[PDB]
Amino acid sequence: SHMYLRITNIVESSFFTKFIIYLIVLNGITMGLETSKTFMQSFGVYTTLFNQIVITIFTIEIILRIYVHRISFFKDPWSLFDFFVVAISLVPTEILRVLRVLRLFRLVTAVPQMRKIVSALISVIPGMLSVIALMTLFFYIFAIMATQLFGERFPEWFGTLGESFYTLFQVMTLESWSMGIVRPLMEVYPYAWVFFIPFIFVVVFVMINLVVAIIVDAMAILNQKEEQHIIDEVQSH
Amino acid sequence: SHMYLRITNIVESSFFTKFIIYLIVLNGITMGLETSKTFMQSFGVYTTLFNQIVITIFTIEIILRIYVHRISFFKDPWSLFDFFVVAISLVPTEILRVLRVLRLFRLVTAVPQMRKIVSALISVIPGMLSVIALMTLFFYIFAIMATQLFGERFPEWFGTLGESFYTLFQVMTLESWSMGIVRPLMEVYPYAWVFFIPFIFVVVFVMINLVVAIIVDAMAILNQKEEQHIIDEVQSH
Amino acid sequence: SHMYLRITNIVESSFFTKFIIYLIVLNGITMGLETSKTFMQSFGVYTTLFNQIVITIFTIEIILRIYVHRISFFKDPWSLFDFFVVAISLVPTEILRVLRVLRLFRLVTAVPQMRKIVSALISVIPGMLSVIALMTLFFYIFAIMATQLFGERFPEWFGTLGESFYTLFQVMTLESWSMGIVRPLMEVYPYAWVFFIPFIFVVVFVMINLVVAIIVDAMAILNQKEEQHIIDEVQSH
Amino acid sequence: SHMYLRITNIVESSFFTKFIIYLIVLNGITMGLETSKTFMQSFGVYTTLFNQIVITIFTIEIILRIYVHRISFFKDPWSLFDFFVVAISLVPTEILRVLRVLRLFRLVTAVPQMRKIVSALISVIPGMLSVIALMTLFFYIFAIMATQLFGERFPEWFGTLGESFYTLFQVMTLESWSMGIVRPLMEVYPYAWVFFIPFIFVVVFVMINLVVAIIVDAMAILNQKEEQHIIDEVQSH
Numbered sequence: 001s002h003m004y005l006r007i008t009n010i011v012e013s014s015f016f017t018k019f020i021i022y023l024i025v026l027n028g029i030t031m032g033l034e035t036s037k038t039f040m041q042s043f044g045v046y047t048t049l050f051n052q053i054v055i056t057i058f059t060i061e062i063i064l065r066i067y068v069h070r071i072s073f074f075k076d077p078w079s080l081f082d083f084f085v086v087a088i089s090l091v092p093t094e095i096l097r098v099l100r101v102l103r104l105f106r107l108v109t110a111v112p113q114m115r116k117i118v119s120a121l122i123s124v125i126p127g128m129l130s131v132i133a134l135m136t137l138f139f140y141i142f143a144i145m146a147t148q149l150f151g152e153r154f155p156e157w158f159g160t161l162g163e164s165f166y167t168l169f170q171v172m173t174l175e176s177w178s179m180g181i182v183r184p185l186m187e188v189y190p191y192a193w194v195f196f197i198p199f200i201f202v203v204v205f206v207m208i209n210l211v212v213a214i215i216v217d218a219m220a221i222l223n224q225k226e227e228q229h230i231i232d233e234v235q236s237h
Numbered sequence: 238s239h240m241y242l243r244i245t246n247i248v249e250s251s252f253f254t255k256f257i258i259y260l261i262v263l264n265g266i267t268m269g270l271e272t273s274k275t276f277m278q279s280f281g282v283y284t285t286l287f288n289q290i291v292i293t294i295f296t297i298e299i300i301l302r303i304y305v306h307r308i309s310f311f312k313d314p315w316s317l318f319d320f321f322v323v324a325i326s327l328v329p330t331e332i333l334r335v336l337r338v339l340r341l342f343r344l345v346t347a348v349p350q351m352r353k354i355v356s357a358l359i360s361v362i363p364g365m366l367s368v369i370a371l372m373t374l375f376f377y378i379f380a381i382m383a384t385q386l387f388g389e390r391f392p393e394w395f396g397t398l399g400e401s402f403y404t405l406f407q408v409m410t411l412e413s414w415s416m417g418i419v420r421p422l423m424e425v426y427p428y429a430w431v432f433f434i435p436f437i438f439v440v441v442f443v444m445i446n447l448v449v450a451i452i453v454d455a456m457a458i459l460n461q462k463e464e465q466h467i468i469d470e471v472q473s474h
Numbered sequence: 475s476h477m478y479l480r481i482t483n484i485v486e487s488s489f490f491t492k493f494i495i496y497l498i499v500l501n502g503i504t505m506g507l508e509t510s511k512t513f514m515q516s517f518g519v520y521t522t523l524f525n526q527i528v529i530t531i532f533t534i535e536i537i538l539r540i541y542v543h544r545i546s547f548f549k550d551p552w553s554l555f556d557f558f559v560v561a562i563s564l565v566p567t568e569i570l571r572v573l574r575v576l577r578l579f580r581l582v583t584a585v586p587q588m589r590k591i592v593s594a595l596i597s598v599i600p601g602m603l604s605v606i607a608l609m610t611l612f613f614y615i616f617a618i619m620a621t622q623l624f625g626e627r628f629p630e631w632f633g634t635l636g637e638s639f640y641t642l643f644q645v646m647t648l649e650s651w652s653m654g655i656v657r658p659l660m661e662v663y664p665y666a667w668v669f670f671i672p673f674i675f676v677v678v679f680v681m682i683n684l685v686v687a688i689i690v691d692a693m694a695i696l697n698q699k700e701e702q703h704i705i706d707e708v709q710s711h
Numbered sequence: 712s713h714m715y716l717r718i719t720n721i722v723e724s725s726f727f728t729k730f731i732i733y734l735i736v737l738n739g740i741t742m743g744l745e746t747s748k749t750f751m752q753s754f755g756v757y758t759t760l761f762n763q764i765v766i767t768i769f770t771i772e773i774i775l776r777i778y779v780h781r782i783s784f785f786k787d788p789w790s791l792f793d794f795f796v797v798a799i800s801l802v803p804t805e806i807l808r809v810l811r812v813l814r815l816f817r818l819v820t821a822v823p824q825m826r827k828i829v830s831a832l833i834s835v836i837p838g839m840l841s842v843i844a845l846m847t848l849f850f851y852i853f854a855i856m857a858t859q860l861f862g863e864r865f866p867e868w869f870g871t872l873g874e875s876f877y878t879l880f881q882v883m884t885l886e887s888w889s890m891g892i893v894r895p896l897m898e899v900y901p902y903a904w905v906f907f908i909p910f911i912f913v914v915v916f917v918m919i920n921l922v923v924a925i926i927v928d929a930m931a932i933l934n935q936k937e938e939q940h941i942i943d944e945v946q947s948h
């Protein structure tokens with residue numbers, strides 16, 4: 001309650017937060033430099049210790065932040081991310097070596113402007129889950145159908161549920177859907193177009209109508225809010 | 238009127254609807270498993286009977302639902318779909334074997350959240366039919382023109398009205414329209430671009446303007462509705 | 475003033491307009507049939523005379539419509555289109571043979587629902603001309619630059635102002651812009667990306683912002699209109 | 712203060728501005744003509760002097776405009792652009808020879824309608840910088856990760872941070888992302904899809920949600936503005 005407040009003033013200080021951001025930017029520059037074989041041959045020794053130093057400092061920081069925030073730390077998504085991103089970077093030296101770079105997203109955690117962007121962007125998602133679920137069910141059914149219609153003759157694209165899922169996603173982005181998949185398919189299965197065209201219609205119609213519904217429903221609420229404000233004034237005056 | 242109500246309380250019960258959804262999810266898992274040759278070699282016998290069982294249960298369910306809803310059953314699109322999807326799965330064991338998977342969309346029929354999504358999405362369509370008709374006429378005219386401009390020299394892409402329709406749809410999605418179709422066409426017909434560019438302009442302009450019109454007209458009605466509410470208050474107070 | 479009204483009641487009659495639409499649909503079916511070599515071998519004789527008949531009837535119709543509408547006929551875009559589309563089909567039997575199919579768009583001229591769609595869609599265009607002009611100037615400048623940067627070494631894609639225009643349009647649709655054009659270009663000109671990336675940014679930013687501006691400005695006017703209505707009520711009550 | 716006003720009436724005159732636009736259009740036509748080797752063989756001599764003449768006139772114009780506007784000239788973006796675009800064209804005769812064409816954008820500087828378009832389009836950008844920054848950080852992190860996951864085995868696409876940036880941008884436009892990059896990658900790295908799919912989801916989700924937020928926030932302000940106007944009337948009457 002006394003040594004506590006000492007470190008709480010540190011962890012909460014403007015300097016503390018600025019320092020950590022400084023390190024994030026430095027280490028971010030460093031991780032781009034470590035991309036050059038030339039650079040690594042000359043200064044790899046320096047950059048590697050600086051990475052260990054930065055992660056040590058970040059470890060101390062996370063530790064301090066937990067002593068200060070106590071339980072609230074692990075009920076906070078931004079610090080949960082800081083935690084797991086620094087924890088990943090702690091596992092001893094193979095894909096984890098690459099996931100270490102995710103600690104640069106810490107620059108989103110630390111900068112309030114960036115948090116508001118991400119929070120704002122994330123906020124459409126909860127209301128989209130049922131549509132996403134519906135779409136995932138749609139993909140699943142069509143992936144099953146495509147696996148068994150086309151998998152024997154086109155193993156790479158449809159031989160497996162996973163592969164059909166992948167290909168169906170490719171068709172959704174419209175990437176080479178016709179020259180690359182459906183025309184080749186139609187040389188064996190001339191009615192393949194009866195499968196993929198409707199698939200393309202549904203998947204594109206749903207995406208567009210999802211955007212239309214977000215905008216139009218947003219404004220419906222905007223209208224409800226100003227309607228109450230105007231009516232209250234009328235009711236009051 | 239008495240044995241009727243006995244089964245009506247069953248068919249209307251929370252348990253009845255939950256049970257059927259349970260089966261849909263189980264059978265949905267099962268149909269993904271039947272995709273693995275390995276899995277089928279080991280447990281194909283089990284999964285096949287479970288499919289026959291599920292379809293038997295679904296047959297009993299449809300039958301019960303018709304006795305309970307009487308005529309209203311066949312005037313209801315969700316149960317019409319349940320009907321035809323279960324009926325398909327009833328035809329004896331080849332493409333129908335694959336259409337059996339459509340009974341997984343029954344998970345949309347049974348889950349009210351999913352119905353509202355689909356109903357919502359479908360509701361733009363009635364007001365789009367005339368535009369869709371106009372676009373289909375557009376495709377038809379340009380498919381006729383392309384068949385006779387390019388079909389002799391490019392049979393695969395334009396030799397037939399059907400093939401030209403297909404290719405025109407591909408050009409609409411912009412998939413390989415230039416490297417894959419129009420540049421090859423222009424090596425024989427250097428003015429082919431005078432055909433496909435304007436085609437691309439119209440088809441893209443119409444899609445975008447359709448989205449713009451749905452959003453803007455939706456808000457026009459939103460504005461009309463709150464205008465009347467505010468004015469009525471003014472008129473009343 | 476007397477024989478005039480006789481034909482005016484004809485030309486204005488519900489039957490007259492329905493008959494012509496009937497012919498348009500029939501001849502539209504016919505023009506799709508004439509696409510099949512098989513069909514032409516058997517019934518080409520019949521279809522060809524029916525085409526001459528239909529065009530004769532359409533010629534009489536246009537003539538009647540001009541006597542009835544007088545000058546107003548040539549000040550009306552829908553009848554101007556009917557005129558030129560029937561006139562094209564009148565030139566004696568080579569690309570004009572294919573333009574004959576454009577008389578099927580007459581089904582848009584004759585059906586009021588279709589006219590409203592087309593009128594509605596066309597109505598955004600006048601306010602877009604300056605943006606279109608700006609974009610065309612943009613294409614022109616970049617086509618000049620690309621012709622002289624890349625035309626010697628890549629004649630097919632940039633050897634000519636016209637070809638560079640074509641390729642630039644292809645890059646705008648994002649069709650094979652990188653694997654098909656810019657990566658090949660970068661093997662000779664490693665900074666080609668400094669040309670096409672910014673080009674892609676501008677062209678995509680302008681299209682999106684054009685859509686955003688149409689929607690948002692539409693609603694600005696919608697808001698101005700209901701604001702005046704509400705305020706007038708407040709002012710009146 | 713006296714010879715000053717003499718040239719100020721010139722530089723501000725309707726004729727002065729029209730003359731310069733005339734030259735811009737002429738020189739714009741000329742620069743398209745200089746694209747034809749045939750044309751240059753015959754009239755290249757003429758066009759080259761006309762280019763030197765035009766640039767001399769533009770130099771005099773810029774000089775006059777600076778004497779008239781004094782400091783205000785270099786605090787004005789449109790004239791700053793005129794300045795640098797004419798200055799580029801002044802460097803003696805290699806890429807600068809091509810940048811000379813940028814003086815045609817002077818037609819945007821000189822035509823007020825075009826300025827309003829460009830100003831309008833630019834006005835969304837300041838509020839987008841933080842999102843753009845967030846997206847650039849996103850690209851940077853994923854470019855680092857992709858360089859080290861895939862660069863050794865796929866040097867052309869990922870061997871270098873710059874190349875990975877380029878490829879990631881290509882994946883964002885969805886151009887050949889699967890047939891051209893990720894399927895080839897997956898033949899060596901079967902989990903490459905775990906990298907690029909989520910990358911595609913984020914990058915597409917962010918773009919769409921950025922458009923949704925611009926439209927919806929624009930209308931929020933539109934609603935706030937008319938709400939105050941209506942309420943003030945209610946408050947006043």
Ligand SMILES: CCCCCCCCCCCCCC(=O)OC[C@H](COP(=O)(O)OCC[N+](C)(C)C)OC(=O)CCCCCCCCCCCCC
Nearest residue numbers: 149188189190191192193194195198199331332336339342
């Ligand atoms: C509720 C959402 C539903 C969405 C609708 C999507 C479902 C439609 C999928 C049907 C498309 C079939 C595409 C296709 O080509 O499948 C492959 C089969 C293979 O037989 P086939 O092509 O005749 O030749 C085999 C060649 N061989 C001997 C060398 C192997 O080819 C055929 O069997 C061709 C048979 C024509 C199928 C026509 C189906 C019309 C629509 C069916 C669904 C309507 C009820 C919803």
Ligand SMILES: CCCCCCCCCCCCCC(=O)OC[C@H](COP(=O)(O)OCC[N+](C)(C)C)OC(=O)CCCCCCCCCCCCC
Nearest residue numbers: 623662663664665666667668669672673805806810813816
């Ligand atoms: C107002 C809107 C303006 C929009 C900006 C668009 C204008 C930028 C275009 C510059 C991009 C240049 C792309 C390019 O690779 O051009 C080709 C030249 C060719 O020389 P190079 O690539 O060095 O090698 C030639 C190879 N050889 C000997 C076998 C022929 O390659 C080079 O010369 C490379 C030189 C680097 C150019 C860097 C330009 C930075 C931006 C310049 C414009 C800024 C002022 C607006």
